[PDB]
Amino acid sequence: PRRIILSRLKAGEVDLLEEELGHLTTLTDVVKGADSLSAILPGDIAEDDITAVLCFVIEADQITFETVE
């Protein structure tokens, strides 16, 4: 079970994060924020597919997955 927070979007791209991840797999409890969205990605999803997707959906230096057991 893990978390994945990103900081680059704006006031409206939050759903875009949990969206692509929610369109390739089933997220868990993403949260919204000005430009920092925190999605809950487990250890049996497209984890590697998100680190690769989410980053190409925002950048390549503001994405990180912090386990939240």
JSON list of C-alpha atoms in Angstrom, two decimals:
[
{"chain": "A", "resi": 1, "resn": "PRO", "atom": "CA", "xyz": [0.00, 0.00, 0.00]},
{"chain": "A", "resi": 2, "resn": "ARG", "atom": "CA", "xyz": [1.60, 3.35, -0.83]},
{"chain": "A", "resi": 3, "resn": "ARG", "atom": "CA", "xyz": [1.05, 7.05, -1.54]},
{"chain": "A", "resi": 4, "resn": "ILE", "atom": "CA", "xyz": [2.06, 9.05, -4.61]},
{"chain": "A", "resi": 5, "resn": "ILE", "atom": "CA", "xyz": [2.16, 12.83, -4.28]},
{"chain": "A", "resi": 6, "resn": "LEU", "atom": "CA", "xyz": [2.83, 15.23, -7.17]},
{"chain": "A", "resi": 7, "resn": "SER", "atom": "CA", "xyz": [3.42, 18.99, -7.25]},
{"chain": "A", "resi": 8, "resn": "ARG", "atom": "CA", "xyz": [3.11, 20.76, -10.60]},
{"chain": "A", "resi": 9, "resn": "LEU", "atom": "CA", "xyz": [-0.57, 20.84, -11.63]},
{"chain": "A", "resi": 10, "resn": "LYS", "atom": "CA", "xyz": [-2.80, 23.83, -10.85]},
{"chain": "A", "resi": 11, "resn": "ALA", "atom": "CA", "xyz": [-6.25, 24.35, -9.30]},
{"chain": "A", "resi": 12, "resn": "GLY", "atom": "CA", "xyz": [-8.07, 21.79, -11.48]},
{"chain": "A", "resi": 13, "resn": "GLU", "atom": "CA", "xyz": [-5.45, 19.26, -12.68]},
{"chain": "A", "resi": 14, "resn": "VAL", "atom": "CA", "xyz": [-5.75, 17.28, -9.43]},
{"chain": "A", "resi": 15, "resn": "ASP", "atom": "CA", "xyz": [-8.53, 15.13, -10.92]},
{"chain": "A", "resi": 16, "resn": "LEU", "atom": "CA", "xyz": [-6.18, 14.72, -13.91]},
{"chain": "A", "resi": 17, "resn": "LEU", "atom": "CA", "xyz": [-3.75, 12.76, -11.70]},
{"chain": "A", "resi": 18, "resn": "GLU", "atom": "CA", "xyz": [-6.26, 10.40, -10.05]},
{"chain": "A", "resi": 19, "resn": "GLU", "atom": "CA", "xyz": [-7.94, 10.42, -13.49]},
{"chain": "A", "resi": 20, "resn": "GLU", "atom": "CA", "xyz": [-5.17, 8.91, -15.64]},
{"chain": "A", "resi": 21, "resn": "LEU", "atom": "CA", "xyz": [-4.42, 6.57, -12.73]},
{"chain": "A", "resi": 22, "resn": "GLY", "atom": "CA", "xyz": [-8.16, 6.03, -12.30]},
{"chain": "A", "resi": 23, "resn": "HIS", "atom": "CA", "xyz": [-8.37, 5.35, -16.06]},
{"chain": "A", "resi": 24, "resn": "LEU", "atom": "CA", "xyz": [-5.51, 2.82, -16.15]},
{"chain": "A", "resi": 25, "resn": "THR", "atom": "CA", "xyz": [-6.26, 1.23, -12.78]},
{"chain": "A", "resi": 26, "resn": "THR", "atom": "CA", "xyz": [-8.33, 1.83, -9.61]},
{"chain": "A", "resi": 27, "resn": "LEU", "atom": "CA", "xyz": [-6.85, 4.44, -7.35]},
{"chain": "A", "resi": 28, "resn": "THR", "atom": "CA", "xyz": [-7.69, 4.33, -3.64]},
{"chain": "A", "resi": 29, "resn": "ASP", "atom": "CA", "xyz": [-8.28, 7.81, -2.14]},
{"chain": "A", "resi": 30, "resn": "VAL", "atom": "CA", "xyz": [-6.60, 10.61, -4.06]},
{"chain": "A", "resi": 31, "resn": "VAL", "atom": "CA", "xyz": [-6.70, 14.09, -2.50]},
{"chain": "A", "resi": 32, "resn": "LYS", "atom": "CA", "xyz": [-6.88, 17.52, -4.13]},
{"chain": "A", "resi": 33, "resn": "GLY", "atom": "CA", "xyz": [-4.84, 20.70, -3.57]},
{"chain": "A", "resi": 34, "resn": "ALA", "atom": "CA", "xyz": [-3.73, 23.90, -5.33]},
{"chain": "A", "resi": 35, "resn": "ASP", "atom": "CA", "xyz": [-1.05, 22.07, -7.35]},
{"chain": "A", "resi": 36, "resn": "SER", "atom": "CA", "xyz": [-0.15, 19.17, -5.03]},
{"chain": "A", "resi": 37, "resn": "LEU", "atom": "CA", "xyz": [-2.35, 16.08, -5.47]},
{"chain": "A", "resi": 38, "resn": "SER", "atom": "CA", "xyz": [-1.75, 13.04, -3.24]},
{"chain": "A", "resi": 39, "resn": "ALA", "atom": "CA", "xyz": [-3.04, 9.78, -4.68]},
{"chain": "A", "resi": 40, "resn": "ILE", "atom": "CA", "xyz": [-3.15, 6.48, -2.83]},
{"chain": "A", "resi": 41, "resn": "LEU", "atom": "CA", "xyz": [-1.48, 3.85, -5.01]},
{"chain": "A", "resi": 42, "resn": "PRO", "atom": "CA", "xyz": [-1.05, 0.36, -3.62]},
{"chain": "A", "resi": 43, "resn": "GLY", "atom": "CA", "xyz": [1.59, -2.22, -4.20]},
{"chain": "A", "resi": 44, "resn": "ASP", "atom": "CA", "xyz": [-0.45, -4.13, -6.79]},
{"chain": "A", "resi": 45, "resn": "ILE", "atom": "CA", "xyz": [-1.48, -1.47, -9.31]},
{"chain": "A", "resi": 46, "resn": "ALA", "atom": "CA", "xyz": [0.33, 0.09, -12.24]},
{"chain": "A", "resi": 47, "resn": "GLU", "atom": "CA", "xyz": [2.71, 1.65, -9.72]},
{"chain": "A", "resi": 48, "resn": "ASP", "atom": "CA", "xyz": [5.52, 1.73, -12.26]},
{"chain": "A", "resi": 49, "resn": "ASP", "atom": "CA", "xyz": [2.91, 2.77, -14.83]},
{"chain": "A", "resi": 50, "resn": "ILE", "atom": "CA", "xyz": [2.03, 5.80, -12.72]},
{"chain": "A", "resi": 51, "resn": "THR", "atom": "CA", "xyz": [5.54, 6.97, -11.88]},
{"chain": "A", "resi": 52, "resn": "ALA", "atom": "CA", "xyz": [5.89, 6.90, -15.67]},
{"chain": "A", "resi": 53, "resn": "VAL", "atom": "CA", "xyz": [2.43, 8.30, -16.50]},
{"chain": "A", "resi": 54, "resn": "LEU", "atom": "CA", "xyz": [1.82, 10.87, -13.76]},
{"chain": "A", "resi": 55, "resn": "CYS", "atom": "CA", "xyz": [5.29, 12.30, -14.44]},
{"chain": "A", "resi": 56, "resn": "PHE", "atom": "CA", "xyz": [4.63, 12.58, -18.17]},
{"chain": "A", "resi": 57, "resn": "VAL", "atom": "CA", "xyz": [1.35, 14.21, -17.17]},
{"chain": "A", "resi": 58, "resn": "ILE", "atom": "CA", "xyz": [3.14, 16.92, -15.14]},
{"chain": "A", "resi": 59, "resn": "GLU", "atom": "CA", "xyz": [6.96, 16.69, -15.28]},
{"chain": "A", "resi": 60, "resn": "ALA", "atom": "CA", "xyz": [9.83, 14.46, -14.12]},
{"chain": "A", "resi": 61, "resn": "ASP", "atom": "CA", "xyz": [10.94, 15.89, -10.76]},
{"chain": "A", "resi": 62, "resn": "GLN", "atom": "CA", "xyz": [7.79, 16.48, -8.67]},
{"chain": "A", "resi": 63, "resn": "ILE", "atom": "CA", "xyz": [6.42, 12.92, -8.47]},
{"chain": "A", "resi": 64, "resn": "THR", "atom": "CA", "xyz": [7.20, 10.51, -5.60]},
{"chain": "A", "resi": 65, "resn": "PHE", "atom": "CA", "xyz": [5.54, 7.43, -4.06]},
{"chain": "A", "resi": 66, "resn": "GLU", "atom": "CA", "xyz": [5.66, 7.35, -0.23]},
{"chain": "A", "resi": 67, "resn": "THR", "atom": "CA", "xyz": [4.37, 4.01, 1.15]},
{"chain": "A", "resi": 68, "resn": "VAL", "atom": "CA", "xyz": [1.67, 4.62, 3.76]},
{"chain": "A", "resi": 69, "resn": "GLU", "atom": "CA", "xyz": [1.19, 1.19, 5.33]}
]
